[PDB]
Amino acid sequence: RSCIDTIPKSRCTAFQCKHSMKYRLSFCRKTCGTC
Q: What does the H/E/C string look like for the chain?
């Protein structure tokens, strides 16, 4: 697969990336999410 995000760091910080599963599993699949 490919790692992408509809929003990155913008609405993703270790707090949102570790706590908002959708943020890591879908919003930030670019890194915060999956890379």
A: CCCCCCCCHHHCCHHHHHHCHHHHHHHCCCCCCCC
- Asked if 19 and 29 touch (Cβ cutoff 8 Å), the reply is no
Is residue 26 within 8 Å of 15, Cβ to Cβ?
no
Domain residue spans of the chain: 1-35
Beta-carbon count within 10 A of 8 CB: 16
Q: 15: Cβ–Cβ under 8 A, 6 or more apart, which residues? A: none
Q: What is the phi/psi pair of residue 31, to 5°?
A: -165, -55
